[PDB]
């Protein structure tokens, strides 16, 4: 009782401490402020934006990335981010003066493969109740739009890349996929059941096991056709592109998907690797997020843990070779859209006494912080003196009018703090890091498939 | 030089008083807050706009002043508000849903008398320099669209008032004068110079300068006709009226502008006096704008000046008698238009250390504070314990979509410190007030033609 | 509503660090906790948190509260706000749990500096309510009629004078197939005053 009085909320105490904050200027200052406008708009620090706001680099890559693409109301940024740094390559080797690679295509099957990951992890969680924590959070969004950079390359090995010419963002869906994922996902939830009915009284081998989950993929696919048509050409089937280059010039390249991705993409699926800051963990440890991906049988994801000086000189390295960054981070923790500038003290929060001293890894385990976004790193500022990197440049996949055309400056700071991975080639990394993917020696440390550090949605 | 030193701005004192100014938190959010909004927004209190958006008043005029008057881009408030008081006797007296008299009419008939004054007045003053501050002064704005309530029973008197469905604000120079103005104020400042330079060699009862000042009139009536027609009846000239009442009868009346204003509009041009609180001046004494006016030969601005405390209790009395009352103010001081509401401590300035000690009468003299705008008392709320009145309900013609429905709540406070003049009829004053007006024996305090307390424009 | 509003935040917010300390015991991975540290201060409620709120603070006309303030006719900003600072109260909270009981004084403290804050943090988005459950107010209105008049009363005395309530008699019924029908329902921890009444649906 006496514990519980205390704990209650007391009419008398508050009011005491109302008339004790109303005696202090800058509290009435804030509350006269605060409840005019959004606290972001009021807080916002011109002084500070002042000065952050600088885009000037010094080590840069030497393509531009033209023109601004745009994934509108889905959460397709990793794919775009993916693909953002692969296109790069194909204009520079063919001059072009605008080129995209087609995002829509590894949309549609990423979204296809999920649907039937999903039913496979039902069948192998139909032991587990209804209710339990794992079923219910597999029923809660089986076709999200995120992904991580280990299912990107998941559907590149089976299905390849092809320019955008051929298959574009043409269907209502794909630039908002709210509805057709809320129609899919029912139907799922609705196999779901069908599945672990049955397979009370038989075996996930039984043919009739076998025959409905055939007949499900089948209905999967029909109802996604419905909404986006299967790509015009198969992985290793050929297909035809007329272009044109800066110079005006006409040029046709047969290719298949699966050569594309190669022969003029230049993806290599075997170097890429995932670094982390994820300090709830120790550092030079593999980090391992159970039963997430997109492919049935595919890649898990897989970081290496590292800490931030060894991530930013990562990022610096992979710059100096010419080389656009990917990395996931918290959106739009302390992201200004309207000047692209990241920034955590861009707002003056501390000047109406709102301060936080809560720590990355307890922000991680509190569930406070984890990766949303993914976006590409393609320029950043090494200070002379013997110094580091100070602010990094950004491009985002929402269009020319967000941030400044499109990019965002990202303070050293805000890397350390509010970004979590980079991906970068194994052949980038020193001995003593790479051979932790190498050799066979790495117990990796195994999260949850709910874990805050996943897919980047 | 000592002293122009001292008096000197120094660069490293202001930058001393920032790095003071940056210590204090209040400061720091103040400077954050004011780089991002307007002051207004950002220090509008919304913990006393719950207070004072009070919209009870127990002490209200009978009739509704339906449909809400718009004066649009133009200095007509006086006009409106004028017409606001009276067209209420003719919806009562009829029975109208809606009915308003013509404000054009007035207008018309103001602008071309006031062009007409214009002359007269340079060639009365004809003998001082071209640079004298009167004569600069009478060519600042000759034809502006403010007025004050003299001048509106001036206009009455000679032309009468007539329906607005004879003659409405059409043309587009009624709801947008500026241009009009210019066009018309460049051609008199043209005849200016060429009376005054006639003036020279001749006398201004020579026949020829008598020519010259019609061959003006004639041109600035020609001009005036091609932005609005004359009326369509002399003030004499019988019009014919059809209209609705609002048991759906028909009717017809049949009378003269000048007939009208009596007859209908129950308007005595012999009763209204104009009340003013002018704290320069002692009370008691009657003030007198020398010059101001728009009909030649017609009355002179004159006010009675007396207290707040008599002034209040006129407003009330008046109400009381169920009659709006007109009145004049520093628009749009301490007004809020989105919420229609007029309270000088409804921003917290005070919380940015942004105090205004200046007295009333030290900001009429200092150029801070002026008569504006012309609107309508139509209502206030007396308080029952013996008290006075602590609110008033104001009618402004901005349109309906301006403060609430056209409707404004004003203090008392405000109403004592940002109002100045009322008028009622001198058969509501007190024998001791009304004699001030009936007697002869009172001399006017006579105040120059650009004195702060004149035309509400 | 932004009477009712203000209040079930306050107490919402405050409910959870009563459930944080309440499941101290339990890793910060649990499902319990991770739930708790997913929305503690949605605007989401039920009808018996209505009732806990009516009974604790009455309810009074808009007249005298609205919805001026701009938080509350878009509170995810201020939510996110609060419940950024909550998540950093669990920390500390559970992390001086390890140590202590929670009913160590240390405990006691470091909760009400807590309440303290967080009432700090919301006054800054809305005001208090200018009058307590007990305290009279005066609220001036106008009939049909045009007719005038002037109502003294206190929120407590006002919601069953004027509106009528009895929180005695609602209860809420529900069609739920996962139960068998003719059994009460309850759903454990739901709430947002400490100590007020549950979640319970007639099936």
Same mark, same amino acid.
């Given at each position: 009782?006496?514990?519980?009085?205390?704990?209650?909320?007391?009419?008398?105490?508050?009011?005491?401490?109302?008339?004790?904050?109303?005696?202090?200027?800058?509290?009435?200052?804030?509350?006269?402020?605060?409840?005019?406008?959004?606290?972001?708009?009021?807080?916002?620090?011109?002084?500070?934006?002042?000065?952050?706001?600088?885009?000037?680099?010094?080590? +840069?890559?030497?393509?531009?990335?033209?023109?601004?693409?745009?994934?509108?109301?889905?959460?397709?940024?990793?794919?775009?981010?993916?693909?953002?740094?692969?296109?790069?390559?194909?204009?520079?080797?063919?001059?072009?003066?605008?080129?995209?690679?087609?995002?829509?295509?590894?949309?549609?099957?990423?979204?296809?493969?999920?649907?039937?990951?999903?039913? $496979?992890?039902? +069948?192998?969680?139909? $032991?587990?109740?209804?209710?339990?924590?794992?079923?219910?959070?597999?029923?809660?969004?089986?076709?999200?739009?995120?992904?991580?950079?280990?299912?990107?390359?998941?559907?590149?090995?089976?299905?390849?890349?092809?320019?955008?010419?051929?298959?574009?963002?043409?269907?209502?869906?794909?630039?908002?996929?709210?509805?057709?994922?809320?129609?899919?996902?029912?139907?799922?939830?609705?196999?779901?059941?069908?599945?672990?009915?049955?397979?009370?009284?038989?075996?996930?081998?039984?043919?009739?096991?076998?025959?409905?989950?055939?007949?499900?993929?089948?209905?999967?696919?029909?109802?996604?056709?419905?909404?986006?048509?299967?790509?015009?050409?198969?992985?290793?089937?050929?297909?035809?592109?007329?272009? +044109?280059?800066?110079?005006? #010039?006409?040029?046709?390249?047969?290719?298949?998907?699966?050569?594309?991705?190669?022969?003029?993409?230049?993806?290599?699926?075997?170097?890429?690797?995932?670094?982390?800051?994820?300090?709830?963990?120790?550092?030079?440890?593999?980090?391992?997020?159970?039963?997430?991906?997109?492919?049935?049988?595919?890649?898990?994801?897989?970081?290496?843990?590292?800490?931030?000086?060894?991530?930013?000189?990562?990022?610096?390295?992979?710059?100096?070779?010419? #080389?656009?960054?990917?990395?996931?981070?918290?959106?739009?923790?302390?992201?200004?859209?309207?000047?692209?500038?990241?920034?955590?003290?861009?707002?003056?929060?501390?000047?109406?006494?709102?301060?936080?001293?809560?720590?990355?890894?307890?922000?991680?385990?509190?569930?406070?912080?984890?990766?949303?976004?993914?976006?590409?790193?393609?320029?950043?500022?090494?200070?002379?003196?013997?110094?580091?990197?100070?602010?990094?440049?950004?491009?985002?996949?929402?269009?020319?009018?967000?941030?400044? $055309?499109?990019?965002?400056?990202?303070?050293?700071?805000?890397?350390?703090?509010?970004?979590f991975q980079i991906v970068v080639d194994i052949n980038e990394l020193p001995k003593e890091l790479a051979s932790k993917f190498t050799s066979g020696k790495e117990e990796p440390i195994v999260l949850?498939?709910? $874990?805050?550090?996943?897919?980047?949605?």
């Amino acid at each position: 009782f006496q514990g519980a009085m205390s704990s209650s909320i007391d009419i008398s105490k508050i009011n005491s401490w109302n008339k004790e904050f109303q005696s202090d200027l800058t509290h009435q200052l804030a509350t006269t402020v605060l409840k005019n406008y959004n606290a972001d708009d009021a807080l916002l620090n011109k002084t500070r934006l002042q000065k952050q706001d600088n885009r000037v680099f010094n080590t +840069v890559v030497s393509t531009d990335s033209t023109p601004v693409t745009n994934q509108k109301s889905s959460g397709r940024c990793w794919l775009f981010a993916a693909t953002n740094q692969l296109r790069l390559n194909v204009l520079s080797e063919l001059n072009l003066k605008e080129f995209e690679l087609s995002q829509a295509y590894l949309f549609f099957y990423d979204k296809l493969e999920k649907a039937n990951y999903f039913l $496979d992890q039902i +069948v192998s969680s139909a $032991d587990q109740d209804i209710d339990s924590r794992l079923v219910q959070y597999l029923l809660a969004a089986p076709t999200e739009d995120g992904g991580q950079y280990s299912m990107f390359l998941n559907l590149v090995k089976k299905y390849g890349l092809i320019p955008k010419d051929l298959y574009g963002d043409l269907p209502y869906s794909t630039t908002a996929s709210r509805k057709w994922n809320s129609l899919l996902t029912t139907k799922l939830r609705e196999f779901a059941e069908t599945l672990r009915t049955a397979l009370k009284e038989r075996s996930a081998d039984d043919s009739i096991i076998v025959t409905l989950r055939e007949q499900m993929q089948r209905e999967i696919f029909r109802l996604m056709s419905l909404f986006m048509d299967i790509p015009p050409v198969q992985p290793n089937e050929q297909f035809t592109w007329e272009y +044109v280059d800066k110079d005006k #010039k006409i040029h046709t390249i047969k290719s298949t998907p699966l050569e594309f991705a190669s022969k003029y993409a230049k993806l290599d699926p075997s170097t890429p690797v995932s670094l982390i800051n994820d300090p709830r963990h120790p550092y030079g440890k593999l980090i391992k997020i159970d039963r997430l991906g997109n492919v049935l049988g595919g890649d898990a994801v897989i970081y290496l843990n590292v800490d931030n000086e060894t991530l930013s000189k990562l990022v610096v390295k992979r710059l100096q070779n010419n #080389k656009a960054v990917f990395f996931g981070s918290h959106t739009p923790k302390f992201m200004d859209k309207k000047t692209g500038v990241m920034d955590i003290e861009l707002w003056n929060y501390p000047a109406i006494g709102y301060n936080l001293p809560q720590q990355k890894a307890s922000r991680i385990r509190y569930h406070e912080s984890l990766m949303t976004h993914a976006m590409l790193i393609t320029g950043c500022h090494v200070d002379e003196t013997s110094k580091l990197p100070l602010r990094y440049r950004v491009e985002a996949s929402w269009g020319k009018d967000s941030g400044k $055309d499109g990019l965002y400056v990202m303070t050293q700071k805000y890397f350390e703090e509010y970004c979590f991975q980079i991906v970068v080639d194994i052949n980038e990394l020193p001995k003593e890091l790479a051979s932790k993917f190498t050799s066979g020696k790495e117990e990796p440390i195994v999260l949850p498939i709910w $874990d805050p550090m996943g897919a980047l949605a």
